[PDB]
Ligand binder design. Structure first.
Ligand SMILES: *C(=O)N1C[C@H](NOS(=O)(=O)O)CC[C@H]1C(N)=O
Ligand SMILES: NC(=O)[C@@H]1CC[C@@H]2CN1C(=O)N2OS(=O)(=O)O
Length: 251
């Protein structure tokens, strides 16, 4: 059933929530239900879905696929090269995913998000939050018009990885490959993606870790989310919290 749980010890004083769902036995474990139901920008967690869009549309084809780096200078060393899908995903390389999505027409993206029930499915601000001054390093998924709740993230993850969408199984497997995480515990498989943004209206972070976990037959889909007012709280910090929860309660 739906169990309300207390994972606050693992959050070590940071404000947030968590939801874990096992769809075989319909076990919903929820910490901070209000937050779990609140829609926010997905930030870089949207790269999970953008990857599948690019694969389905043929813009990319494998974890080796490239997007034609043009020499633009970036402060992240690893963005300055013709990187593969696998490396762009793990580096959260914004230029790679912006070029990818701008090869896809807006109607196709709208219909895919509608089919996935991806939050408000609002792509109206296609080029993103331009008032932050970052120009082409912006898009509808980065503190802009698209918003989704942690509950809805888990529901989307489950539909994708349980095979209930029309995405090709080959493409799902590419995603699984590039999302795998090493947590120094061979008895569980963890997959996920971080995201980091700052909600300027509410003066709160949107710090995310969303993904799935396999252990001994069972699979849990999960979303961990902070909304702290402390700007030091990032996606990577929230991934730490998620792994602590997994090791304590799901091992
Ligand atoms: C992903 O979450 N990223 C972090 C950061 N997001 O900030 S934004 O929502 O204001 O755009 C920049 C994009 C991306 C990254 N790691 O570059
Ligand atoms: N970012 C990760 O993947 C985290 C961080 C370090 C390793 C891998 N992993 C863990 O869970 N670790 O910690 S450890 O279990 O204490 O060795």
């Amino acid at each position: 059933s739906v169990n309300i749980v207390d994972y606050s010890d693992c959050f070590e004083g940071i404000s947030g929530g968590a939801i874990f769902c096992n769809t075989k036995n319909k076990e919903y474990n929820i910490y901070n239900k209000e937050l779990i139901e609140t829609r926010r920008s997905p930030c870089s967690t949207f790269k999970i879905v953008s990857t599948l869009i690019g694969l389905e549309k043929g813009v990319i084809n494998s974890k080796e696929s490239v997007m034609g780096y043009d020499g633009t200078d970036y402060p992240n060393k690893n963005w300055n090269k013709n990187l593969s899908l696998e490396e762009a995903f793990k580096e959260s390389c914004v230029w790679y995913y912006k070029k990818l999505i701008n090869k896809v027409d807006a109607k196709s993206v709208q219909n895919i998000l509608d089919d996935l029930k991806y939050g408000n499915c609002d792509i109206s601000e296609w080029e993103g939050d331009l008032k932050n001054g970052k120009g082409h390093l912006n898009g509808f998924w980065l503190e802009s018009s698209l918003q989704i709740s942690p509950k809805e993230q888990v529901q989307t993850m489950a539909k994708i990885f349980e095979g209930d969408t029309n995405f090709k199984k080959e493409h799902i497997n590419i995603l699984r490959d590039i999302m795998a995480i090493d947590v120094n515990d061979a008895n569980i498989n963890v997959y996920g993606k971080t995201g980091t943004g700052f909600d300027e209206k509410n003066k709160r972070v949107d710090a995310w870790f969303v993904g799935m976990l396999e252990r001994e037959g069972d699979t849990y889909y999960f979303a961990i989310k902070s909304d702290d007012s402390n700007k030091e709280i990032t996606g990577p910090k929230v991934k730490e919290i998620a792994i602590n929860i997994i090791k304590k309660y799901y091992s």
